Amino acid sequence: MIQLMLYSLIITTSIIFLNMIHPLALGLTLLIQTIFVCLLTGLMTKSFWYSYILFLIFLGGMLVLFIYVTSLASNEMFNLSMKLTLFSSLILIFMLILSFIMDKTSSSLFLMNNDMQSIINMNSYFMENSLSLNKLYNFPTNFITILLMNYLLITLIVIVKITKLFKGPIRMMS
Amino acid sequence: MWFEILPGAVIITTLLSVPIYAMYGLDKLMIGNAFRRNMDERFSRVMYQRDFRLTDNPYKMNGLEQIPDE
Amino acid sequence: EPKDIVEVPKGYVYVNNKELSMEFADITDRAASTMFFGELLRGFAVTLAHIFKEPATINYPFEKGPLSPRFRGEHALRRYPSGEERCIACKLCEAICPAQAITIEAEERADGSRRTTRYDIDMTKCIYCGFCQEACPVDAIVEGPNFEFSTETHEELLYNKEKLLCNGDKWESEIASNLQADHLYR
Amino acid sequence: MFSIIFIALLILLITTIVMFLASILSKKALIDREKSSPFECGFDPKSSSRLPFSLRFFLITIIFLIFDVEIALILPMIIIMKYSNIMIWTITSIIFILILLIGLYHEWNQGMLNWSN
Amino acid sequence: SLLKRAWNEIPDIVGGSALALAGIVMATIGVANYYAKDGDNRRYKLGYVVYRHDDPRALKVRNDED
Amino acid sequence: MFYMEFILSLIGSLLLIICVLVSVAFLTLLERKVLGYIQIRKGPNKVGLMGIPQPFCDAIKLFTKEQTYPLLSNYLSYYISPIFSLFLSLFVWMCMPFFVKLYSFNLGGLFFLCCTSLGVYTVMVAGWSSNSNYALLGGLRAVAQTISYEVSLALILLSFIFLIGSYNMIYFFFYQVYMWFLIILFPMALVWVSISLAETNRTPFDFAEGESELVSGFNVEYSSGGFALIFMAEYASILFMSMLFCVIFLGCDVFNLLFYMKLTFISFVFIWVRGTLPRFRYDKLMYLAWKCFLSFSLNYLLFFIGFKILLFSLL
Amino acid sequence: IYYLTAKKVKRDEIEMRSAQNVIFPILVAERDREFLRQLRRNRDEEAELMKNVPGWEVGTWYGEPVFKTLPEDTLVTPIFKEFYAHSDWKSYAKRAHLKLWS
Ligand SMILES: COC1=C(OC)C(=O)C(C/C=C(\C)CC/C=C(\C)CC/C=C(\C)CC/C=C(\C)CC/C=C(/C)CC/C=C(\C)CC/C=C(\C)CC/C=C(\C)CC/C=C(\C)CCC=C(C)C)=C(C)C1=O
Ligand SMILES: CCCCCCCCCCCCCCCCCC(=O)OC[C@H](COP(=O)([O-])OCC[N+](C)(C)C)OC(=O)CCCCCCCCCCCCCCCCC
Ligand SMILES: CCCCCCCCCCCCCCCCCC(=O)OC[C@H](COP(=O)(O)OCCN)OC(=O)CCCCCCCCCCCCCCCCC
Ligand SMILES: CCCCCCCCCCCCCCCCCC(=O)OC[C@H](COP(=O)(O)OCCN)OC(=O)CCCCCCCCCCCCCCCCC
Ligand SMILES: CCCCCCCCCC(=O)OC[C@H](COP(=O)(O)OCCC(C)C)OC(=O)CCCCCCC
Numbered sequence A: 001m002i003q004l005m006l007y008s009l010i011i012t013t014s015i016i017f018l019n020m021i022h023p024l025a026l027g028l029t030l031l032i033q034t035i036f037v038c039l040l041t042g043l044m045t046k047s048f049w050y051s052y053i054l055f056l057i058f059l060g061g062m063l064v065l066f067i068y069v070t071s072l073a074s075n076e077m078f079n080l081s082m083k084l085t086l087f088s089s090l091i092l093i094f095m096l097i098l099s100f101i102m103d104k105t106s107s108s109l110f111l112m113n114n115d116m117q118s119i120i121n122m123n124s125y126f127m128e129n130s131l132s133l134n135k136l137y138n139f140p141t142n143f144i145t146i147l148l149m150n151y152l153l154i155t156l157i158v159i160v161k162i163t164k165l166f167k168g169p170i171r172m173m174s
Numbered sequence B: 001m002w003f004e005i006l007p008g009a010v011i012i013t014t015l016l017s018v019p020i021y022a023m024y025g026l027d028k029l030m031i032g033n034a035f036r037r038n039m040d041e042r043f044s045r046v047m048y049q050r051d052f053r054l055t056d057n058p059y060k061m062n063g064l065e066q067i068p069d070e
Numbered sequence C: 001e002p003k004d005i006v007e008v009p010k011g012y013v014y015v016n017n018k019e020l021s022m023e024f025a026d027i028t029d030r031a032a033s034t035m036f037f038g039e040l041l042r043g044f045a046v047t048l049a050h051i052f053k054e055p056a057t058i059n060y061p062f063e064k065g066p067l068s069p070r071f072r073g074e075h076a077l078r079r080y081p082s083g084e085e086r087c088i089a090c091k092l093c094e095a096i097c098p099a100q101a102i103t104i105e106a107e108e109r110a111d112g113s114r115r116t117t118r119y120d121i122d123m124t125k126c127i128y129c130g131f132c133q134e135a136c137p138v139d140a141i142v143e144g145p146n147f148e149f150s151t152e153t154h155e156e157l158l159y160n161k162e163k164l165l166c167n168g169d170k171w172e173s174e175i176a177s178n179l180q181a182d183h184l185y186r
Numbered sequence D: 001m002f003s004i005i006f007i008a009l010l011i012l013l014i015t016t017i018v019m020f021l022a023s024i025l026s027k028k029a030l031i032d033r034e035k036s037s038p039f040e041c042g043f044d045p046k047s048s049s050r051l052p053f054s055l056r057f058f059l060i061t062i063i064f065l066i067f068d069v070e071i072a073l074i075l076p077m078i079i080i081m082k083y084s085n086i087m088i089w090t091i092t093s094i095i096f097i098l099i100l101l102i103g104l105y106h107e108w109n110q111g112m113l114n115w116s117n
Numbered sequence E: 001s002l003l004k005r006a007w008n009e010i011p012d013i014v015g016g017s018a019l020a021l022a023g024i025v026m027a028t029i030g031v032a033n034y035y036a037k038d039g040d041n042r043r044y045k046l047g048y049v050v051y052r053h054d055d056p057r058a059l060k061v062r063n064d065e066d
Numbered sequence F: 001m002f003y004m005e006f007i008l009s010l011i012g013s014l015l016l017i018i019c020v021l022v023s024v025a026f027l028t029l030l031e032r033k034v035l036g037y038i039q040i041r042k043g044p045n046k047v048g049l050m051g052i053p054q055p056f057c058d059a060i061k062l063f064t065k066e067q068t069y070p071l072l073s074n075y076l077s078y079y080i081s082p083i084f085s086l087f088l089s090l091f092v093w094m095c096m097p098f099f100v101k102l103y104s105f106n107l108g109g110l111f112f113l114c115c116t117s118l119g120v121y122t123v124m125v126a127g128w129s130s131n132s133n134y135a136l137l138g139g140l141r142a143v144a145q146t147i148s149y150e151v152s153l154a155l156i157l158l159s160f161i162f163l164i165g166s167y168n169m170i171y172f173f174f175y176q177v178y179m180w181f182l183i184i185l186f187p188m189a190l191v192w193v194s195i196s197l198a199e200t201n202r203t204p205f206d207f208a209e210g211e212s213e214l215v216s217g218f219n220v221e222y223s224s225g226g227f228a229l230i231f232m233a234e235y236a237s238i239l240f241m242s243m244l245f246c247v248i249f250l251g252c253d254v255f256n257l258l259f260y261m262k263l264t265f266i267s268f269v270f271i272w273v274r275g276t277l278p279r280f281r282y283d284k285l286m287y288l289a290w291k292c293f294l295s296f297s298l299n300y301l302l303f304f305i306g307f308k309i310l311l312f313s314l315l
Numbered sequence G: 001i002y003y004l005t006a007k008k009v010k011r012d013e014i015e016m017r018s019a020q021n022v023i024f025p026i027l028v029a030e031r032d033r034e035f036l037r038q039l040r041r042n043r044d045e046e047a048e049l050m051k052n053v054p055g056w057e058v059g060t061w062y063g064e065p066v067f068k069t070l071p072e073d074t075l076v077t078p079i080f081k082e083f084y085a086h087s088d089w090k091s092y093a094k095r096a097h098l099k100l101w102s
C-alpha cells in the first residue's frame, strides 16, 4: 500500500517537475522527489544503506545549486496556475483510488527484501550491509576503487583549472 | 547566589529522564516484559516470527509445560 | 625573555613590540596552547570562577542603590518654618535655566509682599542641573530626592505652581536634611 | 521504516497544528501600509534582495561537493574490515586517505581554499 | 628549516602527520602480525560450517582454548 | 508485528516529543539563568516563584502577538519553513538510543547526518523567503557554514564509528562499560564541541543569526510564532548535540540519572562557550573547517585505521 | 583499556553467535518440513484452480518447462510470489514487511 502511494506521489511530483519554469520550484520538487525515491529504493534492498547514501549525495549537491540560484536567476517571477493544481489533485486522488482497489500482491516488487529471503540462506544472517559493500574493498574490484580515487583527484584538478579563482567572484553582469 | 541555577536544571534532568523510565513502566503494564524485542539482527527477527507464530503474544513465553509427557 | 623590536624611550610603553621567540621551547609551548586550547581553557576557568561570585544585583524596589545628599531630582518649592512660601519672584532661576523651562509671572500680593502668581516648570524641558538651586537667594527652589515620578501622560510632566508646592510640602524632611548636610559645600 | 513515515507525518501534523494555533490566538490588528515593508534597518531599501549575489567561494562549494561524494565511499569500510582480506583493505584505506591528503594539501599549496577576492 | 616553520605556523598539521605516521607503522605491524600466524583461518567462524574428515579444510581447523 | 508495539512506539515517541519541548523551554530558562551568572548579574527571578514560569511568560506572549504579513516576501514559502525546522529538529530525536526498543536504528549516524543537513535547509529557505537583505545574508552565511562543517562532521563521526565497528549507537554502550571515550578522544572532544556549535548555529559560530554583524540574521522578518518555532528548533538541536556529546564521549547508559545530569552539564557547557568566547568570521570558519579540522580528521582516521588493524590481529 | 573492553565485547558477541549456531538446526528443520507441506498444498491448490484453463499444466508455463538442463526429480526453490500466490495481502505484509514496520 505504501509502495503504490510512493508510485502515485512520484508520478504527481514528476508532472509538477516537468511543468515548473522557476529553478526554486524545480529544487523543491526534486527535494520531495528524492525523498520519495530514497524511500522507494529502500523497499527493494535488504538493508537501507544506499537510500541514506543517495540522500547525503542529493543534499550535498543542491546546497551548492541554491547559491547559484541566488547568484544567477535570483529575480524571476513565480506563476501559480489553477490548471496544474486541479490536474495534480485529480490524478493524485485517482491513483490513490486505483491503488486502493488494486491487488497489492501483483503490484508489489519481485526484488527480495531481508525478510523475503528464506531461512536457509546463511548469508542473510550476517551483518546487513557487509556482503553487499564487500566488493568495493575486495581483490577483483579494488582497482576500480583506485580508479575512482584518481578520477576524483582529476575531477578536482579540472574544477580548479576551469574555475579560475583569481579572476574574481561570479554574479550576473560581472 | 549560585545555587539558584539548580532550579531550572533539575527539571531538564527529571523530564528528559521521563520518556525512558515511563516506558519501563508502560511496557510492564501491557507487554509484561520491560524490554520489547530488538530487531537489529536478522536472526532475532526470525525468532520473533517464530514466537508470534507460536503465540499471539510474542512476549508470552512457552515453558516446559507446553511439552507433553511421554 | 623575548627581545624588543624597537627600543623604548623613557616614560613610554610600547605594546605589541616583543619579537616572537624562535627557540624550540617557546614554539612547543605556543603549539601546545594552539592545539590543546590553552588560552580558551584559561578563559573558561576565569568564567567558571566568576560563576561562583556573589551577584551585584539589588532587589528593586525593596533594595535601592546608594545616593548622595547633593542628588538632583524633581524640582520643589520650599516654604519657611513660619509657613510662608520662600519664593520672592526674583526670576533669577528662570534667567539661569539654560533650556528656559521655568515661566514666572508675578504681581504684588494683597498684604504687599512680593510673591508669584505663576511658577511653571516644563519638566520635559528641564535637564535636572541644579542651576535654579544655586541661583536661588532664599533657597526656595531645590532638587528633591524624588526620581520615581514617571507619568503616563505628557501633560503631567509640566509642573504648575501647586504641584511644586505639593512636592515641597511632601518632600520637606529629606530636602531639609540635604540642605542641612550640604549648605557649607555651596 | 513504515513506522518512521507515520511518526514523521505525525510530527509534521503536530507542528502544523501548533503553528495554526499560534496564528489563531495571535492578535488580529489591521495591516498598515509601511508595517509590512522589509526592515532594512529603518530606511528605504534602494534594492530588492532578489538582486544577484556575488559568490566568492564557488571553488570551495564544488570542492565540498567532490569531497562529499568522497565521504560516500569511506562509510562502507567500517563493516568490510571483519569480512575481507586485511592486506587489500589496508592498501585501499591508506591509499584512499593519502590521496585525499595529497589533494587537500596540494590545493592548500596553490591557495585555492582561499576565497576569491 | 622547513620543520620549524611548519611547527610554528601549522602545528596541528605536524601533530596529525605524526599521528598518521604512527598509524601507518601500526597498520604495518598489525598486517605483519595478522599474516605471521594463520590469520586467514580464524578460530571462530561465522555461520554453521561442517567439514567431513576427508576434506582438505578439515585438518586446518584450530583446536585452541577459549 | 505485534499490535501493542506500534501503540507503545507511538506513545514513547509522543512522550519524547513533549518532554523535549518542555526541556527546550527549561533550556531557555537555564541559559537565561546561568548566562546571567556567567556575568555578575542574576537570572530571571521576579516572575512566578523564583523565575521557574518565565518560559511560560515567554511562550504566552509569543503565541498572542501579531503575526507579521510581510510585503515583498513569498508568504506561502515564509509560513511553512519554521514548521519544517521544528519538524526536523524533533524528528532527529527519534535517533535516541533507548535500552528498550524505541526504534531499531541500525544506521543512526546516517539518519543524524540526513536530519543535520535538512535543518540547515529549513534555515536557508526561511532566510531567502523573508525578502530582506539581512535575511538573505544570514541564509547565505548558514549555507557557507554548513558547507564548511559538513564533511568535517562526517569524517570525525567515522573515526568514532571505527572504535565501535557498527553504525548502531547502542553499541556505544558496550564499548564504554569500563571507561568513557573522553580519555581517547579529547582532541575530538574539542573538535566535536567546535562542530556541534557550528551545527546548532551557536557562539563562536553564530553567523546565521547575528546580532551585531547583521540584525537578528535570518530571523529579521519572523515574529510571534515563526520566531518561536525557529527558536525551539535551534534549542532542540542544542539538546540533541548535547545528548550526542554524552553518547559518544561519555557513558551511553540511559537507566542512570547521571546520564541526564551529564546532559544538563553539557548543555551548561553549550551556554558556557557562548558566554566566554567572541564570535569568529565565517571566512575564518571556512579556513578552519577545511585546513585544520578536515586534515586532523583524515590524519587521526589514519591513526584509527592502523590501530584497528593492530587490534584485530591481537584478537 | 579499550583493547580490554574490545576483548569483553568480542567474548559476548562470540557467545551470542554460539547460541545462534546451536539454536539454528531445529529452526531450519521445522522450516523445511513446513516448506514441503506448503509446497504440497500449493501444488494441490494450483491443480484445483487451473482445471478450467485448457492449455495449463501443473508447474509449467502452458506446457513449456520453466527450468531445463536439470535432473527430472530435482527441486528448485520457488519465488516469494508463487509461495504467496493463494493468499491475501495480509500474509505478504505479515512476512515481507517485518523489518520495515519494526
Ligand atoms: C557606544 O555606542 C553605542 C550606543 O550609543 C550610546 C547605543 O545606544 C547602543 C545600543 C544598546 C542599547 C540600547 C542597550 C545595550 C544592549 C544590550 C546590553 C543587549 C545585550 C544583552 C543580551 C543580548 C541579553 C543576554 C543574552 C541572553 C540572556 C540569551 C537569551 C536571550 C533571549 C532573548 C532568549 C529568550 C527567548 C525565548 C525564551 C523565546 C520564547 C519561546 C519559548 C519559551 C518556546 C518554548 C516552549 C515551551 C517551553 C513550552 C511549549 C510546549 C509545547 C508546545 C508542548 C506542550 C504540550 C503539552 C500537552 C504539555 C550600542 C550597541 C552602541 O554601541
Ligand atoms: C569540563 C570541560 C571544560 C572545557 C569545555 C570546553 C572545551 C574546549 C573548547 C571547545 C570548543 C570551543 C569553541 C570553538 C573554538 C574553536 C577555536 C579554534 O579552533 O580556533 C582556531 C585556531 C587557529 O589557530 P591559531 O589561533 O594558532 O591561528 C594561527 C594559525 N593559522 C592562521 C595558520 C591557522 O586553533 C586551531 O585551529 C587549533 C587546532 C584545533 C584542533 C586540534 C588539533 C589537534 C591535533 C593533534 C595533536 C597531536 C599532538 C601530538 C601527538 C604525537 C603522537 C606521536
Ligand atoms: C607515507 C607517504 C606519505 C606521502 C604524503 C602524504 C600526504 C602528506 C602527509 C603530511 C606531510 C606534510 C604535509 C605538509 C604540507 C601541508 C600543507 C601546507 O603547508 O600548505 C602550504 C601552506 C599554504 O598556506 P595557506 O594554507 O594558504 O595559508 C597560510 C597557512 N594557513 O603554507 C603553510 O602552511 C606554510 C608553512 C610551511 C609549509 C611547508 C611545510 C612542509 C614541512 C614538511 C615536514 C614537516 C611536517 C611533518 C613533521 C612531523 C613528521 C612526523
Ligand atoms: C518538504 C517540502 C514540502 C513542500 C510542500 C508543503 C505543502 C504544505 C501544505 C501547503 C498548503 C497551502 C495552503 C495555503 C492557504 C493560504 C494561502 C495564503 O497565502 O493565505 C494568506 C493568508 C494571509 O496572508 P496575506 O494577507 O496574503 O499576506 C501576504 C501579503 N504579502 O495567510 C494566512 O492566513 C496564514 C495561514 C493561516 C492558516 C489557518 C487555517 C485555519 C485553522 C485550521 C485549524 C486550526 C486548529 C488549531 C487547534 C486544533 C486543536 C485540536
Ligand atoms: C518530510 C520528510 C523529510 C525528510 C526525511 C528524510 C529521512 C532520511 C532519508 C531516508 O531516506 O531515510 C531512510 C530511513 C530508513 O530507515 P532507517 O534505516 O533509518 O531505520 C529502520 C527503521 C523502524 C527499524 C527504525 O527512512 C526514514 O528515515 C523515513 C523517512 C520518512 C519520511 C516521511 C515523509 C515522506
Ligand code: SF4
Pocket: C075, C093, C096, C097, C098, C099, C101, C102, C121, C125, C126, C127, C128, C129, C130, C131, C132, C133
Ligand atoms: S534643574 Fe536646571 S533645567 Fe531644571 S528647572 Fe532648574 S535650572 Fe532649569
Ligand code: SF4
Pocket: C086, C087, C088, C089, C090, C091, C092, C093, C094, C104, C135, C136, C137, C138, C139, C140, C141
Ligand atoms: S530664584 Fe528662587 S526666589 Fe527667585 S524667582 Fe526663582 S524660586 Fe523664586
